Amino acid sequence: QVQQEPSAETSEGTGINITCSHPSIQAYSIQWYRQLPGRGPAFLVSAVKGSKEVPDPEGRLSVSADSRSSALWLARPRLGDAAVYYCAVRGSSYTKLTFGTGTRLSVQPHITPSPSVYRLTSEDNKNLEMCLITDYSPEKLDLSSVDSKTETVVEVATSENKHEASYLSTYWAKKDEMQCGAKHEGFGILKGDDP
């Protein structure tokens, strides 16, 4: 009944619009929530008509003239704004709140690539190896030969730049059956060695 796009993506500092469509409901009031990882939905803004400023994340909510749709504009998304954004509408003052399916927002930091690959070992399980790919550009990294890898983005507080961002991918396997590598546009073959 309350429809949202499943996912959205934007680069840091590039604004993005998150839509919400409910043709069968003429909203009495519209609310938006966001669910950050390891947290429950948190209230962002509520409006009955027109456009309303949002304190955090900076932006503006605009309700359609017929109150059958709305849009949440994030004016300056940062990495911390990556979450699942929910719209919730009410057909009347007294009736049920109905939530949308949620839009999963991904925010890509700006990165200077310097892809590197490394092999890691652990003292607790010496017959296991972990492959670490760092400081790469997600659209240029090729991990075609692995399904079991996972990816994240983190920020580290360095000297010159209070918080630099960097991507990390990892995959692990029994030592003997492990081949740590990747291919990355503009860097050729990437392979890991050990101490």
């Binding site: 890691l120 990892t170 692990w172």
Partner: protein
């Protein structure tokens, strides 16, 4: 402060109660169901003490608002169809007033044959080459071998909850018959080269009717 259990694992046909507790003197409380690609669906709500309202998906559930602070959700004859993340929420009253949500309860209903398997938890030593090349140390904590798919992995640095520089997989990776989960903490070389710094990865899970934890430690280098 709205409190609800972190993780619960049930067997088929089991009964169970999820209890939500709130310290805001809120008259409205509610229980919501989140399943992949099915938004948030009201299971049961309450406008006040000893008042309950069925939702759309209430079949399979009962509820009791025993007091102003506490709203119970009862799971009747637990079924695979019960497996979900459950969210309790509250507000001052119903009608265009923000809802305050809890952090959510991950409930998994198992077959009466399958057992819960605790994870194996290791921290990988960071690469000396990465440290030299990037002036940063990435610490990879791996939880593997566990069943079912849900498990929480967190970091503490010197007894304190750490979030800066942590990247944790949101979803478990299916490895054959078991699941694994990975978390990376990337720190500056200066922070790594301190043999007093205690880098702690904790895996929280549910086994034998209760919540359990495994703690793994690695210290910094000289």
């Amino acid at each position: 402060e709205i409190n609800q259990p972190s993780i619960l694992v049930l067997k088929e046909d089991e009964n169970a109660t999820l209890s939500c507790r709130q310290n805001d003197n809120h008259d409205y409380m509610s229980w919501y169901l989140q399943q992949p690609g099915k938004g948030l669906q009201l299971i049961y709500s309450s406008y006040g003490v000893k008042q309950e309202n069925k939702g759309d998906i209430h079949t399979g559930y009962e509820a009791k608002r025993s007091s102003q602070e506490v709203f119970h959700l009862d799971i009747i004859s637990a079924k695979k169809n019960h497996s979900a993340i459950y969210f309790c929420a509250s507000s001052s009253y119903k009608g265009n007033t923000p809802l305050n949500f809890g952090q959510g309860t991950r409930l998994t209903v198992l077959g009466k044959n399958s057992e819960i398997i605790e994870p194996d938890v290791v921290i990988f030593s960071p690469s000396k080459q990465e440290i030299q090349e990037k002036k940063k140390a990435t610490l990879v904590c791996l939880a593997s071998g566990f069943f079912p798919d849900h498990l929480n992995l967190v970091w503490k640095v010197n007894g304190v909850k750490r979030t800066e520089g942590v990247g944790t997989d949101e979803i478990s990776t299916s490895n054959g018959s078991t699941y694994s989960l990975t978390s990376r903490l990337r720190i500056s070389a200066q922070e790594w080269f301190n043999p007093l710094n205690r880098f702690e990865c904790i895996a929280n899970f549910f086994k034998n009717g209760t919540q359990q934890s495994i703690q793994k430690i690695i210290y910094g280098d000289t």
